[PDB]
Write an enzyme that holds these catalytic residues in place. Structure first.
Site, PDB file in Angstrom:
ATOM      1  CB  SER A   1      -2.198  14.184 -13.576  1.00  0.00           C
ATOM      2  OG  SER A   1      -2.569  13.926 -14.912  1.00  0.00           O
TER       3      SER A   1
ATOM      4  CG  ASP B   1      -1.831   1.199   1.299  1.00  0.00           C
ATOM      5  OD1 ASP B   1      -1.943   1.911   0.273  1.00  0.00           O
ATOM      6  OD2 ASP B   1      -2.475   1.393   2.366  1.00  0.00           O
TER       7      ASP B   1
END
Length: 330
Positions: free
Chosen positions: A199, A35
């Site tokens: 992004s 994770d």
């Protein structure tokens, strides 16, 4: 040193991925959810409330000659999905794919929430976010990667998750045969303890690319792709019959649909998530309404590039002095 381990989807939907981890002496092998959105290595154990164990493999520290109780230490964690666990702490030897850390904090669960009990395939989590998020008290502990870093050939790990298929986590090296083209690196903020990046935009299907900054985290422990409501609405508008359902808890679509791809930007580069990766199957057994793999982050407080996004790429988690993230197509 290096390590290399195969990671395997837990079910036919790629709801999560498990990776075998050797703990203790002699080795006890548990299948952990790696994770990158958390920083605790915790396991089901001989100390876990019996009624809360249902098919998981347990760590039994009393059978490990290298286990030592970390005096006075406890841990307690709550995840974005509402689940939680807590317990005490041992140090022991932990190996992943041939890479060994001695003295790793292994957080033994005394209590787990129902969703962990109900998932017999996940024996615990191995956190790979930054150690600043580690919940051990009163002395915070380091992640497996943080402990291994100085010994690795290169201070990196890579995630290569498969679609409906196994993939690989590598530590300490970049497998140049595992991706196509080049790896594009992008800046990381560690201020919230995550692999947080920005992004450069998105496209839906064959549509034009929208240049827009999307701040979010690269999180292997989250199944889906969570993005701003505007982006998500633009995606699902291309699917006939798709709608946001308050009762189901997100966007659903007719199981008969062919989904468009979704592209996200990494600098000037582009990662294409095929449509099929966005199908999470019937909302309930036998339903013809299917759950979408792209959902709104509104109300989470953060955008999450989870498995839906990451499995479309070869992802480098670069733990150099100034961390960065790298993405390549594959």
């Amino acid at each position: 040193s290096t390590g290399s381990a195969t990671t395997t989807p837990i079910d036919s939907l790629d709801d999560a991925y498990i990776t075998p981890v050797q703990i203790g002496t002699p080795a006890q092998t548990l299948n952990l959810d790696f994770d990158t959105g958390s920083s605790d290595l915790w396991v089901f154990s001989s100390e876990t409330t019996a009624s809360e164990v249902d098919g998981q493999t347990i760590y039994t520290p009393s059978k490990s000659t290298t286990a030592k109780l970390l005096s006075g230490a406890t841990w307690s964690i709550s995840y974005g999905d509402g689940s939680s666990s807590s317990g005490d702490v041992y140090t022991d030897t932990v190996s992943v794919g041939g890479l060994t850390v001695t003295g790793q904090a292994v957080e033994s669960a005394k209590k787990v929430s129902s969703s962990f009990t109900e998932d017999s395939t996940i024996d615990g989590l191995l956190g790979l976010a930054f150690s600043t998020l580690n919940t051990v008290s009163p002395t915070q502990q380091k992640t497996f990667f943080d402990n291994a870093k100085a010994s690795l050939d290169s201070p990196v790990f890579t995630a290569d998750l498969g679609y409906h298929a196994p993939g690989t986590y590598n530590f300490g090296f970049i497998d140049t045969t595992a991706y196509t083209g080049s790896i594009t690196y992008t800046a990381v903020s560690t201020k919230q303890g995550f692999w947080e990046w920005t992004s450069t935009g998105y496209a839906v299907g064959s549509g034009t690319f929208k240049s827009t900054s999307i701040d979010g985290i690269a999180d292997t422990g989250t199944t889906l792709l969570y993005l701003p409501a505007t982006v998500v609405s633009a995606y699902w508008a291309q699917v006939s019959g798709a709608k946001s359902s308050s009762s189901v808890g997100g966007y659903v679509f007719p199981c008969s649909a062919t989904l468009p791809s979704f592209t996200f930007g990494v600098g000037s580069a582009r990662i294409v998530i095929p449509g099929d990766y966005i199908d999470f199957g019937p909302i309930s057994t036998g339903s013809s309404s299917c759950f979408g793999g792209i959902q709104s982050s509104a109300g989470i407080g953060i955008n999450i590039f989870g498995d839906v996004a990451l499995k479309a790429a070869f992802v480098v988690f670069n733990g150099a002095t100034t961390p960065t993230l790298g993405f390549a197509s594959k």
